[PDB]
């Protein structure tokens, strides 16, 4: 009932890692698109 154990932080850590790469690119596009 408590979601504090965290058994997927690492399984998604990898994703948060790839998503961080999207931000750097997101900053570039944000300047050309808008």
Curated annotation (Swiss-Prot):
Tissue: Ubiquitous. Highest expression in the brain and muscle. Expressed in oligodendrocytes. Isoform IIA is expressed only in the brain, where it is detected in the gray matter, but not in the white matter. Isoform BIN1 is widely expressed with highest expression in skeletal muscle.
Coiled coil: 15-33
Modification after translation: Phosphorylated by protein kinase C.
N-acetylalanine found at: 2
Subunit structure: Heterodimer with AMPH. Binds SH3GLB1. Interacts (via SH3 domain) with DNM1. Interacts with SYNJ1. Interacts (via SH3 domain) with DNM2. Isoform IIA interacts with CLTC. Isoform IIB does not interact with CLTC. Isoform IIC1 does not interact with CLTC. Isoform IIC2 does not interact with CLTC. Interacts with AP2A2. Interacts with AP2B1. Interacts with MYC (via N-terminal transactivation domain); the interaction requires the integrity of the conserved MYC box regions 1 and 2. Interacts with BIN2. Interacts with SNX4. Interacts (via BAR domain) with BACE1. Binds (via BAR domain) F-actin. (Microbial infection) Interacts (SH3 domain) with HCV NS5A.
Disease: Myopathy, centronuclear, 2: A congenital muscle disorder characterized by progressive muscular weakness and wasting involving mainly limb girdle, trunk, and neck muscles. It may also affect distal muscles. Weakness may be present during childhood or adolescence or may not become evident until the third decade of life. Ptosis is a frequent clinical feature. BIN1 mutations have been found in families segregating autosomal dominant centronuclear myopathy. Patients show adult-onset, mildly progressive muscle weakness affecting selected proximal muscles and all distal muscles of the lower limbs.
Function: Is a key player in the control of plasma membrane curvature, membrane shaping and membrane remodeling. Required in muscle cells for the formation of T-tubules, tubular invaginations of the plasma membrane that function in depolarization-contraction coupling. Is a negative regulator of endocytosis. Is also involved in the regulation of intracellular vesicles sorting, modulation of BACE1 trafficking and the control of amyloid-beta production. In neuronal circuits, endocytosis regulation may influence the internalization of PHF-tau aggregates.
Protein name: Myc box-dependent-interacting protein 1
């Amino acid at each position: 009932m408590a979601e504090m154990g965290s058994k997927g932080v690492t399984a998604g850590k990898i994703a948060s890692n790839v998503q961080k790469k999207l931000t750097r690119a997101q900053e570039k596009v944000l300047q050309k698109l808008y």
